[PDB]
Amino acid sequence: MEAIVGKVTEVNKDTFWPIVKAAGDKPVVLDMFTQWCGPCKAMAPKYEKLAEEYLDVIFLKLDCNQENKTLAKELGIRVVPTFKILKENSVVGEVTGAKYDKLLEAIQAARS
């Protein structure tokens, strides 16, 4: 089997929950974005570096397009990018917009 940490894995309506359920007590971070999104593209490089530094956190991204509509709504989206933080199969935090600092704090909190 292969390890999912150390990188950013893209998910979709069918593969997001199964991954969350197998996370264990590792916090899961989800970057909800769309194509052609300015603030999303700016955050992208930084998000990948976060995945490289925090090996005890699973980093995912979801393209909030037509196909994934049902899941984006279920998770609650208003504007992109939005970051959801999950633990034990539950959303325990959220950061709306490209707020890097607030994102870091949300992650530290989920860990300890």
From Swiss-Prot:
<dbReference type="GO" id="GO:0015035">
    <property type="term" value="F:protein-disulfide reductase activity"/>
</dbReference>
<keyword id="KW-0676">Redox-active center</keyword>
<dbReference type="GO" id="GO:0005829">
    <property type="term" value="C:cytosol"/>
</dbReference>
<feature type="site" description="Deprotonates C-terminal active site Cys">
    <location>
        <position position="31"/>
    </location>
</feature>
<dbReference type="GO" id="GO:0009507">
    <property type="term" value="C:chloroplast"/>
</dbReference>
<comment type="subunit">
    <text>Forms a complex with heterodimeric ferredoxin-thioredoxin reductase (FTR) and ferredoxin.</text>
</comment>
<feature type="disulfide bond" description="Redox-active">
    <location>
        <begin position="37"/>
        <end position="40"/>
    </location>
</feature>
<keyword id="KW-0809">Transit peptide</keyword>
<protein>
    <recommendedName>
        <fullName>Thioredoxin F-type, chloroplastic</fullName>
    </recommendedName>
</protein>
<comment type="function">
    <text>Participates in various redox reactions through the reversible oxidation of the active center dithiol to a disulfide. The F form is known to activate a number of enzymes of the photosynthetic carbon cycle.</text>
</comment>
<keyword id="KW-1015">Disulfide bond</keyword>
<keyword id="KW-0934">Plastid</keyword>
<feature type="site" description="Contributes to redox potential value">
    <location>
        <position position="39"/>
    </location>
</feature>
<feature type="active site" description="Nucleophile">
    <location>
        <position position="40"/>
    </location>
</feature>
<feature type="domain" description="Thioredoxin">
    <location>
        <begin position="1"/>
        <end position="112"/>
    </location>
</feature>
<keyword id="KW-0150">Chloroplast</keyword>
<feature type="active site" description="Nucleophile">
    <location>
        <position position="37"/>
    </location>
</feature>
<keyword id="KW-0249">Electron transport</keyword>
<keyword id="KW-0813">Transport</keyword>
<feature type="site" description="Contributes to redox potential value">
    <location>
        <position position="38"/>
    </location>
</feature>
<comment type="similarity">
    <text>Belongs to the thioredoxin family. Plant F-type subfamily.</text>
</comment>
